[PDB]
Curated annotation (Swiss-Prot), chain A:
Reaction equation(s) it catalyzes: ATP + H2O = ADP + phosphate + H(+)
Disease: Neuropathy, hereditary sensory, with spastic paraplegia, autosomal recessive: A disease characterized by spastic paraplegia and progressive distal sensory neuropathy leading to mutilating ulcerations of the upper and lower limbs. De novo genetic variants in nearly every subunit of the TRiC complex, including CCT5, have been found in individuals with a broad spectrum of brain malformations, and clinical phenotypes ranging from mild to severe epilepsy, developmental delay, intellectual disability, ataxia, and other features of cerebral malfunction.
Protein name: T-complex protein 1 subunit epsilon
Organism: Homo sapiens (Human)
InterPro entries xref list: Chap_CCT_epsi, Chaperone_TCP-1, Chaperonin_TCP-1_CS, Cpn60/GroEL/TCP-1, GroEL-like_apical_dom_sf, GROEL-like_equatorial_sf, TCP-1-like_intermed_sf, TCP-1_chaperonin
Enzyme type, top EC level: hydrolase
Numbered residues of crosslink Glycyl lysine isopeptide (Lys-Gly) (interchain with G-Cter in SUMO2): K186, K190, K241, K251, K255, K368
Reported induction: Down-regulated in response to enterovirus 71 (EV71) infection (at protein level).
Modified residues annotated as Phosphoserine in this record: S2, S322
Principal location listed in the UniProt entry: cytoplasm
GO terms for cellular component: cell body; centrosome; chaperonin-containing T-complex; cytosol; extracellular exosome; microtubule
Binding residue positions for ADP: G29, G81, T82, T83, S151, G398, D468, E484, K489
UniProt-annotated binding residues for Mg(2+): D80
From Swiss-Prot, chain B:
Subcellular localization: Cytoplasm
Keyword ATP-binding: yes
Record keyword Calcium present: no
Source species: Homo sapiens (Human)
Name of the protein this chain belongs to: T-complex protein 1 subunit eta
Pfam families: Cpn60_TCP1 (PF00118)
UniProt similarity note: Belongs to the TCP-1 chaperonin family.
UniProt EC number: 3.6.1.-
Illness association: De novo genetic variants in nearly every subunit of the TRiC complex, including CCT7, have been found in individuals with a broad spectrum of brain malformations, and clinical phenotypes ranging from mild to severe epilepsy, developmental delay, intellectual disability, ataxia, and other features of cerebral malfunction.
UniProtKB/Swiss-Prot annotation, chain C:
GO biological process assignments: binding of sperm to zona pellucida; chaperone mediated protein folding independent of cofactor; chaperone-mediated protein folding; positive regulation of protein localization to Cajal body; positive regulation of telomerase RNA localization to Cajal body; positive regulation of telomere maintenance via telomerase; protein folding; protein stabilization
Gene Ontology MF annotations: ATP binding; ATP hydrolysis activity; ATP-dependent protein folding chaperone; protein folding chaperone; RNA binding; unfolded protein binding
PTM annotation (N6-acetyllysine): residues: K265, K279, K296, K303
GO cellular component: cell body; cell projection; centrosome; chaperonin-containing T-complex; cytosol; extracellular exosome; melanosome; microtubule
Keyword Repressor listed: no
Name recorded for this polypeptide: T-complex protein 1 subunit delta
Disulfide bonds: none
Residues noted as binding ADP in the record, renumbered to the chain: G30, G82, T83, T84, S85, N149, S150, K151, G402, Q487
Reported function: Component of the chaperonin-containing T-complex (TRiC), a molecular chaperone complex that assists the folding of actin, tubulin and other proteins upon ATP hydrolysis. The TRiC complex mediates the folding of WRAP53/TCAB1, thereby regulating telomere maintenance. As part of the TRiC complex may play a role in the assembly of BBSome, a complex involved in ciliogenesis regulating transports vesicles to the cilia.
Record PTM Phosphoserine, positions in chain: S13, S161, S179, S421
Amino acid sequence: KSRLMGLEALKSHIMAAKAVANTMRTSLGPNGLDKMMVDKDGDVTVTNDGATILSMMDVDHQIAKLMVELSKSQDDEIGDGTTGVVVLAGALLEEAEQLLDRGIHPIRIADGYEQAARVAIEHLDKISDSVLVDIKDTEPLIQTAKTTLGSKVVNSCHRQMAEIAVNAVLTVADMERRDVDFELIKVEGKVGGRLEDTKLIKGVIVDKDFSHPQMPKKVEDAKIAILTCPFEPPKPKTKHKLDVTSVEDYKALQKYEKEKFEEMIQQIKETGANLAICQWGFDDEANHLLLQNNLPAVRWVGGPEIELIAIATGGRIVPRFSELTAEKLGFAGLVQEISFGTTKDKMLVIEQCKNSRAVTIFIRGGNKMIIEEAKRSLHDALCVIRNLIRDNRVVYGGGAAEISCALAVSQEADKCPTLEQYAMRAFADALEVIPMALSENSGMNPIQTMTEVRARQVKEMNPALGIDCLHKGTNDMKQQHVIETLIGKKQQISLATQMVRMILKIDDIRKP
Amino acid sequence: GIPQLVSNISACQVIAEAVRTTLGPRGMDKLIVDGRGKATISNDGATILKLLDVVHPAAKTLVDIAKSQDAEVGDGTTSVTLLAAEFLKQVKPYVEEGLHPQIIIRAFRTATQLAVNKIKEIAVTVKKADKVEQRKLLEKCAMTALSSKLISQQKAFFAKMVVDAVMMLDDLLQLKMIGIKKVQGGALEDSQLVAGVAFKKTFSYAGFEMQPKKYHNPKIALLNVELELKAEKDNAEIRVHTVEDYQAIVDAEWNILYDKLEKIHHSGAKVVSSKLPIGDVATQYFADRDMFCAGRVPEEDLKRTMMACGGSIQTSVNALSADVLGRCQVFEETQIGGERYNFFTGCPKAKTCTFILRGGAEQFMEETERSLHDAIMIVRRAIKNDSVVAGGGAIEMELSKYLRDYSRTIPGKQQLLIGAYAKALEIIPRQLCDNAGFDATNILNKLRARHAQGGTWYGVDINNEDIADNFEAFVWEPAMVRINALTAASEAACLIVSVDETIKNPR
Amino acid sequence: YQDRDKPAQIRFSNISAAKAVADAIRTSLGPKGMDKMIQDGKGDVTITNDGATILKQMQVLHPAARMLVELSKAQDIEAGDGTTSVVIIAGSLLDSCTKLLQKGIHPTIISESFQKALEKGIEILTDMSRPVELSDRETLLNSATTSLNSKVVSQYSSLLSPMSVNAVMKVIDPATATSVDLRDIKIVKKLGGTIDDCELVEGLVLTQKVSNSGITRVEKAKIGLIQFCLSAPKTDMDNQIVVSDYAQMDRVLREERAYILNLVKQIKKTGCNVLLIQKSILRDALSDLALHFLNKMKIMVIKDIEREDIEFICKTIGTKPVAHIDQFTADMLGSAELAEEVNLNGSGKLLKITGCASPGKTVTIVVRGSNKLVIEEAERSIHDALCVIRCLVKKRALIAGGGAPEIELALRLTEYSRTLSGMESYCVRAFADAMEVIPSTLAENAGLNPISTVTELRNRHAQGEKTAGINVRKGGISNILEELVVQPLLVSVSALTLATETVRSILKIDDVVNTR
């Protein structure tokens, strides 16, 4: 069993977290150096995502395991600045190591960081700026997120994906409510196509086609029959396993087909059903009879996929042909098929023809890994639009606000007569490490690049300026329109401090 | 003889060292991982020793005493541990100096009864003092527990919720009866209070435009049947070659679910609850006969309902009848934050309730979850015992002067032993100084001198680094529970000093 | 980075070497500071709290740490007080520079940033300080005695303090002359008497006697300093005296007097009536025959004078050394109105020669006493008080004690860094954080918490002024201006000038190699 007490226990935990700090200190920002990850199956992936690093970082030290749980809620809370919380969480302990030598208890540092965090949050609300104040439109909303997708492989079609992201968020949530529900957006994928072939369906979509190519490609009727078996001689759901007894029973099954192909197909018209979505596919004799009556259907639809159709359409499953009725029919505006030219997809696109509370973003692409980068870039882009509708007020990203939060904290330190003032001064210098790392990742002097902006926010002008990380023209990223959300800038300094207080309150780790 | 006792002095101090930084509300946390790799982090001292599983024999002595302090009180078991260890620490140089260990047991047994005589003589009864309604007094003692927290600005709102939760219960109080839910979103002042039992109600399946949410005296059915169509519990599939047989097979799959559902209507259930999910096909049968259906209920919430409605939880559906169906007065659904919540208010056995918090973060509900368990017990023990003493280690400083001044008149070997019992009680406030980051030098040196100047309730102020009259600040702790702890620590130390040689069967 | 060549690793050895010297003397800061033990290889053990004697007995070997020894020696002549504080400032700056070197900053860029911090620092202390009247002897009296009340000899501080003011005022004009030399202040001490008897003699007082000269009193004496020894002929090369009979033996005894009297008569031509002989133990400085011929020419015999006292006499009467009798002239003489030996009970055998009447500004405070430490410790209080009076002549400004000005320096320099660009910000902010160790050290030495004392005093200065400080008398935070514990400005200026430049010097060292 392990046993360690005193200051050596605190310092051992600082170095335990600093190992993960310097690991993720280089993949910060658009110029963040990629990281090569070897999966258990022998695969090799390369990326600079903050959420993917901690997911695969299988560090046995318990102090490092706390940082993995930090990334769980941070993905849905922030998503974009996943790498920025660890460098800040690690930089706070690096300076706190100087405070422990001075003879300060860790909990007083946990109290001082919470004191300085409020000086930072209040300062962010001062320098914020509204964008969509009392204006319902998507012109400034698409362009703001169009710049955020530049640090991924979707730069070739970053303008197309920015429109799909805004059209989807505006669908499942209203701007007047200021309550954007991300659970109403599903992310699927398929190997093939390009980034421009990404479709947005207000409803449900599956990688399934109709039972006959000559079916009606447009189904404007709100008649969707969800069955567990097809309108034909039925067969089981798991495995057919056909086995005839003898030739006498062989000729009788043909007579069963003539009665069942006539009994089930005519039963579709009596209940007013047109689209019969079923589990298993149809026979060639069933499709010939449906072409006479103009009754579409789908073949080989999955189990859990059929359950999702009833959620968006609000219909019910008809497990047997005896209780066929109009009440268990589905509701929809138009169900069509989309064939992507020569690529034989023939998908089942179900729509509601109105502002529904359920959208599906079907990403395409000629490679699986390229689509893998569009998923996280799309999911992180949803967090950008989620906070914008919930808080139209936003501040300048790219390391602009982190320096502004350091000055208001340092300016408020002289008016805080208590032992936590040393923690306020340490929390100020720690906020500067997030932009200082971007200067290093950009290949510039981390010290010369940091102080030139701090003099600009004091001597040159009072508004805050950003650091030229992408090697653009100059500073003042407001001109560059590089703006991140305000809820994320506050949550970054919240979960980072809340994780430090969780570590400072621990003095011993034991395990049998 | 002598050295086996010194081995037990240090063998118990490491146990005290395992929970030394947990004393007080603002104590430190630990990280104990079990064999499965599961993470358990808690500041409660009783939970640390439950998972350590120390195989040392002299260490398990204090473990048995702490479990008795937890079974009766449920709080303050750490104070029994640190005090029991400090009685062994101060007598450590006296054991090796040639003094017998049995003489020490007479000293602790002498000083323990001397403390009960002083505690009962100094404790003050508080029933209707200062001409104040008890609702305000219970609010005054409760709000002080919530100050200096994230909810310090709206603590008056939350302070009024606790007095309403206790008064709604009968004379028998229990901390586990009052459940606390956590719901993310909204402000702090939007936290609601439910007098009945409630659940999250994650049921989002079909059944819209029907299933009325109002009932006069509904029969609450507690089932464990998964009424889904393609369920892992109910199903039907017979692999044969005949075609006409398949029509009867698909009819048998719907009859297994439907034949079991007719038992629910024939039994008289008006509000049917089930742990396992219920499919959209079964919700319509409830909707056609004007029946309320709401599943996806946790098993823990139903145990609070079983104590509230007065029924019984049945696994099978065939046993559903009037014997297990409870009753209530007011059953209604709300829209707290837009999410659906069903709850039964006005039950015959409404001994439990529910309390839903609100806030824009998951961690703000964590600190609120901890503070509410401390404010309830203050109201629980204030009405239980009106004779209480000052909190914040104040009662420990009174005995340090009385027992010391009493030891200065007791000649014999009991002097330095009862005198050392006084200095051993200084471990409680010293840890509150360290566990809160304060300087224990300035506090205890300024606190102990306040009692000789006339102090009788001054203690360690956990908020500010200064001394304060905890009695005037409504920071109270029970007088009898302090006696039950000192009697438990004295019995804990006397069992260790009574041992002089370890005997082990060779195996 | 790869960084095959590692000159930066050589700098850390220079930091850790100098860091150990400051950390050793760190706890002996202030009157309430801890004491240190010094054991000799022979077994002689002594314990004292003097910050200057600690470093001299270290026998430092590392070159980086050897600079801190001369740094303390520099503060002795310039300021003369607060020597213990100079090594903590220099030692603490290197500890902060290590944090900067880890960030990838060059030492020279750090050195230039400290010069802007040193220049800005002196103005922060200059404007906030309290200007005083240098011509007012009352202000120099109060500030000098209050500094000695916390020292060893505090009962006699009320008597020796005005002796330093009148002595400085006698040789230095009031608020006109800025140059002050302590070498023109001789403090002679002998057994018998007490400190209460202090004689401020404007001339010179020697610890020698007039014997075997039978004159013992010269009126209107022309004092002439001659370094040449008047004795029998002594030739280093091989020589032999021709002695034929007992009569030739008598010829040499008479002719030896001819060699002496010819040189004695050479001196009387220039009117020189008093002589001075430099101390020399290598050979006969003066023979027994010369003691009698000088009585015939009425010249007093004065010898065994160390070279340190000749500079005091040179500026007292305008004398010059003569290394050979043939080069002796009337130009290298002095002036004296009266010369004699005044042997009192407690004053001892002292040569009281007054009446300079020549270009020179010199004085002499004769302090009597019975015990050794009575006369010895009283001499230190004169030099300790003379230096503060000397420090105020150059810098006519006072500041609070107990590390009060150091917190004002760190508070405003933190805001000064906010208005800078380049790599000067972190260097100035690191320069201010390094100054927080002096108050935290005095806070620890006074029994208080090290960080709670300095943390609250920063806000007391931001809201008020530097009047609040650390009080070692009562042991706590108090308005030191009410306590009337002050220190001169030149001690803090030189402590920040000599210390920062030594840090910049060590920062300019990339590698060291031993020569032969």
